[PDB]
Design a protein around this ligand. Structure first.
Ligand SMILES: O=C1NC[C@H]2c3c(cccc31)CCN2C(=O)C1CCN(C(=O)c2cc(Cc3n[nH]c(=O)c4ccccc34)ccc2F)CC1
Length: 345
């Protein structure tokens, strides 16, 4: 059988779970009866993205046409009601986000159904290799893991208290080719260990391909700071994007080292087409920041595990900080946590 440790095997089963794929899709009111996971095509979705970008700028017959074209490519099922027309910046945003997750679900599933039936190897091992990622378990006991469990603890935001966070498994990760792609940006200053949360169904995509940035076409709504890779320094701001429910209270979250360099500090939304010369990222300024006094330097990389205090920031659209980079090579994925979401209710 597979020689990979039990917690690593569960992770691989958890990331390639066909049922979580169906269940997220069902949550998107997508109609699996007309389109089950197999019918999911990379083109079916890429073409579906195009339509959305027409609606985006076509903004009064013809819109019915675009929507009917959309809802035909991606058959939903409100059962009755007849699907909502795509006629506003809100309705198009939510649909691109859904589409964005359908891309990864297609990635996850297609990775799964590829490969030879040559079965010397245990299935779990075969699928582990498809991730192109080296994954090891960090000792609960070790100090490395004490910091991580401390970063989780002291950085829950006072206002998110709809749940509590427990660390089941800490994984140390190295995506193939990523050290080499990150290396130039190692020379950049102000490097930081930052959270990125995502739906579990996104992880076959994220491990095999890395955090990537939104393609040539997609709305800029919901992006306070444009198309990039977003991170937070408050664990709970990232955990919220895991989309864990009370019925599904266990999530996957990332800790990534990001080369922020000279940050372009913003208090309000500005899409900004280009970073100014000499700037290497954007930091949205929230009212509540991690206390600098606890900030810890680990191998030339800051860990802002300071508990949430206030900054003299006013007035700002942000409750908590936000960091965005616009080149995928500015990120080096370091840890992946399996989190436990204990809900209050
Ligand atoms: O922890 C964070 N979760 C995400 C979130 C965020 C917030 C602030 C703090 C941290 C959180 C603010 C909102 N967040 C985001 O906006 C996301 C950041 C990263 N995102 C992407 O990198 C992204 C990924 C994809 C997947 C993808 N992209 N490009 C491809 O060619 C591709 C090809 C196959 C499969 C998937 C993709 C598409 C659009 C994207 F914007 C989505 C937007």
């Amino acid at each position: 059988k597979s020689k990979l440790p039990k917690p690593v095997q569960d992770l691989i089963k958890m990331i390639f779970d066909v049922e979580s794929m169906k269940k997220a899709m069902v949550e998107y009111e997508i109609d699996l009866q007309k389109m089950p996971l197999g019918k999911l095509s990379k083109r079916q979705i890429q073409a579906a993205y195009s339509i959305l970008s027409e609606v985006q700028q076509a903004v009064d017959s013809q819109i019915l046409d675009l929507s009917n074209r959309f809802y035909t490519l991606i058959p939903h099922d409100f059962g009755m009601k007849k699907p909502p027309l795509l006629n506003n910046a809100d309705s198009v945003q939510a649909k691109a986000e859904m589409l964005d997750n359908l891309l990864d679900i297609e990635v996850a599933y297609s990775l799964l159904r590829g490969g030879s039936d040559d079965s010397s190897k245990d299935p779990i091992d075969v699928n582990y290799e498809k991730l192109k990622t080296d994954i090891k378990v960090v000792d609960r006991d070790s100090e490395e893991a004490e910091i991580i469990r401390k970063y989780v603890k002291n950085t829950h935001a006072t206002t998110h208290n709809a749940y509590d966070l427990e660390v089941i498994d800490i994984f140390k990760i190295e995506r193939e080719g990523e050290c080499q792609r990150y290396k130039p940006f190692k020379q950049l200053h102000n490097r930081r260990l930052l959270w990125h949360g995502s739906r579990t169904t996104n992880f076959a995509g994220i491990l095999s391909q890395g955090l990537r940035i939104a393609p040539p076409e997609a709305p800029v709504t919901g992006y306070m700071f444009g198309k990039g890779i977003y991170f937070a320094d408050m664990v709970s701001k990232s955990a919220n994007y895991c989309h864990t429910s009370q019925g599904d209270p266990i999530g996957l979250i990332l800790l990534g080292e990001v080369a922020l360099g000279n940050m372009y500090e913003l208090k309000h939304a500005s899409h900004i087409s280009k970073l100014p010369k000499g700037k290497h990222s954007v930091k949205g300024l929230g009212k509540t920041t991690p206390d600098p006094s606890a900030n810890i330097s680990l191998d030339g990389v800051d860990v802002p595990l300071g508990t949430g205090i206030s900054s003299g920031v006013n007035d700002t659209s942000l409750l908590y900080n936000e960091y965005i980079v616009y080149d995928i090579a500015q990120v080096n994925l370091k840890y992946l946590l399996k989190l436990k979401f204990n809900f209050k209710t």
